[PDB]
């Protein structure tokens, strides 16, 4: 299971597009509402609980910040970084508090 | 027949079970073999490992990527043994090979079903007790299989769930025997018919 945060940056959202210029930037705009409606919040809690109960290794999706670089590129780089050192519940709590 | 024949691979000899399975799938039957890591091979472990290492040595000298593919999972090893007994280069043989599914451990589709056994392929009846044998799971693990540990943990988890199910089934059967001795005046009339015709000694 993959759970994304609310308020994903535009530089990260550019990674999801081949042509951000012609894009209408709709990425995650329907997913982000589930962090605020009640049913979506319940579903997110169930996703986290099932990850605790069934997952052995968790990773965080993290992206670089392009606007701080002197490069031409504005599209961020995304990667999964493994969370080591603890129980699955501990590393999920750590990742949850590190979201955004 | 018309149903899927699910066989439990534990305690079965590789080639014997493969011959039976190959004939079944050539007769249009759908066969599923589970727990391929429990399959046995006659002869001691070092000898069978040497056979597999000699198989590993056979690769195309010009391009090993084109050469023979040595599959390391026990399920794939057994599948290849069955393919050796099928005419897999014809359409009929390929359909027969498609009617076969092999698994390491018992996945959730078939872990809730009853598993058959092939006595003509069982080690207990086919092999003298003084003879040595190798475990397909150990042989696969030592020739390159990577999931012996996780399959073992999942299998023990499955066995715990199965033990709980069996305890419930025994409770139900005890309750059925108690019910049978409870409603007996209203049952002995049909019990007599069954006893007369040889059901229900």
């Amino acid at each position: 299971k993959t759970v994304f945060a609310e308020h994903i940056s535009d530089e990260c959202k550019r990674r999801f597009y081949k042509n951000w210029h012609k894009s209408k930037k709709k990425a995650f705009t329907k997913y982000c509402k589930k962090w605020q409606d009640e049913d979506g919040k319940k579903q997110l809690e169930k996703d986290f609980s099932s990850m605790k109960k069934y997952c052995q290794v968790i990773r965080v999706i993290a992206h670089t910040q392009m606007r701080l670089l002197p490069l031409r590129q504005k599209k961020a780089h995304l990667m999964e970084i493994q969370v080591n050192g603890g129980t699955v519940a501990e590393k999920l709590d750590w990742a949850r508090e590190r979201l955004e | 027949e018309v149903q899927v024949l699910v066989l439990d691979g534990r305690g079965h000899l590789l080639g014997r079970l493969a011959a039976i399975v190959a004939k079944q799938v050539l007769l249009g039957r759908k066969v599923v073999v589970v727990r391929c890591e429990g399959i046995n091979i006659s002869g001691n472990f070092y000898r069978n490992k040497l056979k597999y290492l000699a198989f590993l040595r056979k690769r195309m000298n010009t391009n090993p990527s084109r050469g023979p593919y040595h599959f390391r999972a026990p399920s794939r090893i057994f599948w290849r043994t069955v393919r050796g007994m099928l005419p897999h280069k014809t359409k009929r043989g390929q359909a027969a090979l498609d009617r076969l599914k092999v698994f390491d451990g018992i996945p959730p589709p078939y872990d809730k079903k009853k598993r058959m056994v092939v006595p003509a392929a069982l080690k207990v009846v086919r092999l003298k007790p003084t003879r040595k044998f190798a475990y397909l799971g150990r042989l696969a693990h030592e020739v390159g299989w990577k999931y012996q540990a996780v399959t073992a943990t999942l299998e023990e988890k499955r066995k715990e769930k199965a033990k709980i199910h069996y305890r419930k089934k025994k409770q139900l059967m005890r309750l059925r025997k108690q019910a049978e001795k409870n409603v007996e005046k209203k049952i002995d009339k049909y019990t007599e018919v069954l006893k007369t015709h040889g059901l229900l000694v």
Binding site: - | R176, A179, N182, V183, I187, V193, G198, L199
Partner: protein, 139 residues
């Protein structure tokens, strides 16, 4: 661990071969594969018989080895193995199998009806027992 042995006097049930379904008594042993065998009251004249077609029962007669059929028959009739055998669970399982095999179409129909009624009554009582045992309110 073993409870049944091949010995002089041991009664064996013949499972296959020309004399399948009968009882015999072991009179002597030859060459680890065969026995001298004599059922004088079960219509098996004395002859060699492989141990592979024998299934040892729990009855043991008392006579010396290679004694004549007269003495084997006297030992069989005294403490009559025919009635004792017919009383065992083994023999009536065999009998049930035989009379189930000779079941006719009409008998199959009647068995189906009787089994239908019997199973419905038994499962109703099972449901009653489960419901009664579900009334648990205890610390």
């Amino acid at each position: 661990v073993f409870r049944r042995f091949v010995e002089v006097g041991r009664v064996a049930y013949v499972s296959f071969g020309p004399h399948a379904g009968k009882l015999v008594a072991i009179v002597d042993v030859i060459d680890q594969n065969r026995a001298l065998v004599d059922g004088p009251c079960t219509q098996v004249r004395r002859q060699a018989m492989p141990f592979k077609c024998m299934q040892l029962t729990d009855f043991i007669l008392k006579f010396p080895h290679s004694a004549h059929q007269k003495y084997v028959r006297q030992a069989w009739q005294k403490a009559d193995i025919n009635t004792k055998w017919a009383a065992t669970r083994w023999a009536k399982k065999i009998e049930a199998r035989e009379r189930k095999a000779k079941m006719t179409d009409f008998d199959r129909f009647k068995v189906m009806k009787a089994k239908k009624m019997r199973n419905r009554i038994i499962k109703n009582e099972v449901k009653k027992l489960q419901k009664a045992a579900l009334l648990k309110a205890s610390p």
